[PDB]
């Protein structure tokens, strides 16, 4: 190819979208945005295939151009906007807020959310840095640049962000014994407390996690996402609370 | 014409690789700007991204910095004296990086007079300079190493040759004469 692709075949799409393999050849290629390609849910997939609020892409256009959908406090009108993980999608006429969060089976999960919980949003501080004119900022896992953070915020640390002002309300450190959500890899959706960060130099730091039935597994630091302290998730988890069973 | 792929060379074992594709645009090369000394004349090349890149065809002046004093003045370049890659560049007066040119010395000695209250030739510890630098000041031209890439940025910026480099290049000039 001599430039950037604009089409996505149906079987090329990420599996967790649950797109059925007969209704066409193309799947909504999610436009460039806050979240990466293989872990984003376009609004057309969310409104049509999940909520069944639309039957066609033309109805998804009708909804979005009616300006009902708001993704993290702001109105979106692009039907393939990449609404990712830990997202707040508010429908006003239906009086619902949705936290987008993974399920145990590896798929995204509608989470009905009240107003006082929808008012904020977690975000994994991923790159702390010093910008022009000597101001510091943090780059979370959705592109959000937040100038002037707390001096103790480091890489891989969760920050609870007030949405309607884009500000940092508070933060949760990365130590052993915190509650860790896992986002990528085989075990994604298994909420468990972090036991031990096995740390290599130049390689990938693995993380040993142990969850409520005291089961132990290993992931990477890229897939680990800190939620809260022991038994105190800052967000409301989906049903089953992230436990893989038999 | 020019392209800079590594599919037309011999293999590491000494084999001849057959052709794999047509030449691509992202491995282009362009024609060198043999920048000489004359009135200022500068092309602009459009480069990947939308990025401008100024080529110099002829450039007279330049910005030269005195490192030991940490200052910078704009002077006039006289002519290329030494160049470690090609004495044909020395002959044809090409301005490139790592060239050894002679510059005018009047702004440097004017700054020295206005800053240390003392002329040159013919706060005393600060006023003391090196002997070869004083000899060049008495001569009327200063040796300066160019440290800019005038085929890329279109600027000829350099630094005045300080002690050790001046010794090495003085040995080089006297031996090669």
């Amino acid at each position: 190819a001599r430039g950037p692709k604009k089409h996505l075949k149906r079987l090329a799409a990420p599996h967790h979208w649950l797109l059925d393999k007969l209704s066409g050849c193309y799947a909504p290629r999610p436009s460039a945005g806050p979240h990466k390609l293989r872990e984003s849910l376009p609004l057309i997939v969310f409104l049509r295939n999940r909520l069944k609020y639309a039957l066609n892409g033309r109805e998804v256009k009708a909804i979005l151009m009616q300006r009902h959908v708001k993704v993290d406090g702001k109105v979106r009108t692009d039907t393939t906007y990449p609404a990712g993980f830990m997202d707040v999608i508010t429908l006003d006429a239906t009086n619902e807020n949705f936290r987008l969060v993974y399920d145990v089976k590896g798929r995204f999960a509608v989470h009905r959310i009240t107003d006082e919980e929808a008012s904020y949003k977690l975000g994994k501080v991923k790159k702390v840095q010093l910008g022009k004119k000597g101001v510091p900022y943090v780059v979370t896992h959705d592109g959000r640049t937040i100038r002037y953070p707390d001096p103790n915020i480091k890489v891989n640390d969760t920050v609870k962000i007030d949405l309607a002002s884009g500000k940092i309300t508070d933060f949760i450190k990365f130590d052993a014994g915190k509650l860790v959500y896992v986002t990528g890899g085989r075990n994604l959706g298994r909420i468990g407390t972090i036991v031990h960060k096995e740390r290599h130099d130049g390689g990938f730091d693995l993380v040993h996690i142990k969850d409520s039935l005291d089961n132990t597994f290993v992931t990477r630091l890229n897939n680990v996402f800190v939620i809260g302290e022991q038994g105190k998730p800052y967000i409301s988890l989906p049903k089953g609370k992230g436990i893989k069973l038999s | 014409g020019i392209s800079r792929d590594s599919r037309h060379k011999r293999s590491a074992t000494g084999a001849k690789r057959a052709q794999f594709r047509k030449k691509r645009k992202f491995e282009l090369g362009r024609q060198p700007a043999n920048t000489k000394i004359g009135a200022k004349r500068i092309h602009s090349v459009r480069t990947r991204g939308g990025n401008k890149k100024y080529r110099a065809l002829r450039i007279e002046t330049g910005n030269f910095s005195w490192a030991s004093e940490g200052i910078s003045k704009k002077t006039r370049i006289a002519g290329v004296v030494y160049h470690p890659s090609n004495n044909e560049l020395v002959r044809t007066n090409t301005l490139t990086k790592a060239a050894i040119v002679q510059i005018d010395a009047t702004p440097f000695r004017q700054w020295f007079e206005a800053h240390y209250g003392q002329t040159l030739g013919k706060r005393a510890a600060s006023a003391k300079i090196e002997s070869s630098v004083e000899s060049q000041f008495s001569a009327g031209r200063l040796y300066a190493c160019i440290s800019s890439r005038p085929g890329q940025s279109g600027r000829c910026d350099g630094y005045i040759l300080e002690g050790e480099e001046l010794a090495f290049y003085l040995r080089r000039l006297t031996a090669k004469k």
């Binding site: 151009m65 006003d92 006429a93 239906t94 009086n95 | -």
Partner: protein, 224 residues
């Protein structure tokens, strides 16, 4: 030059002032399959069930909880007259658009059921309505203006004979909205009270004309 030759597309922009200038009031000029006049187990209850299906908003959901436990039938309405009306007025003063549609429809139909007994709630009903309309000025919404003035038209139509008998008190109520310093408020309030004026007979009309001319000489300085 308003939009005269319509185009071929389907979704025009229709700014707020354009929507108001297009807007009128008379629902009798309008007509549809009116649900409350169509099904007749109880007017309030029929409209309540339709709006419980249609509307999903927090404010109307709470109102629906309370009064759905209260009303299921006409003697229940006729007995719990005050509780229903005070809850309705509470949420209309809460002033939320997504819920402002069904509560206005229910206020109209509640008066229609409670006809000649509504004349004790009628005054502060009108007061909360005009406070709502001035709030609508503050948040521009042609929807809210259309709903509120259709509720006023319905209340006038349902209590025709009594307000016609007592016409001067109605315009004494609406003068804060009739002489309001906004062209569309004066326009819509004048259309509703104009329907009542058309309905009134000759003697009370003479009294009302004499009174309104005296009030105009009082508002010599006012032109609106």
């Amino acid at each position: 030059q308003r939009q005269t030759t319509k185009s071929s597309k389907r979704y025009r922009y229709s700014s707020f002032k354009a929507r108001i200038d297009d807007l009128k009031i008379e629902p009798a000029r309008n007509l549809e399959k009116r649900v409350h006049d169509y099904v007749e187990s109880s007017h309030f209850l029929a409209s309540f069930d339709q709006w419980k299906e249609i509307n999903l908003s927090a404010k109307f959901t709470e109102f629906a909880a309370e009064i759905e436990h209260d009303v299921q039938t006409l003697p229940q309405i006729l007995y719990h007259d005050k509780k229903i009306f005070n809850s309705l007025v509470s949420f209309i003063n809460f002033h939320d658009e997504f819920s402002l549609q069904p509560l206005l429809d229910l206020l109209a139909q509640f008066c229609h059921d409670l006809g000649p007994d509504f004349l004790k709630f009628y005054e502060e009903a009108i007061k909360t309505l005009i406070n709502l309309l001035d709030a609508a000025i503050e948040f521009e919404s042609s929807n809210v203006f259309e709903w509120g003035f259709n509720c006023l038209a319905y209340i006038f139509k349902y209590l025709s004979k009594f307000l016609v008998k007592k016409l001067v008190l109605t315009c004494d109520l609406l003068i804060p909205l009739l002489s309001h310093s906004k062209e569309y408020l004066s326009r819509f309030s004048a259309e509703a009270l104009s329907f009542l004026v058309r309905k009134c007979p000759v003697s009370n009309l003479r009294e009302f004309v004499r009174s309104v001319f005296e009030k105009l000489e009082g508002d010599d300085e006012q032109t609106n």
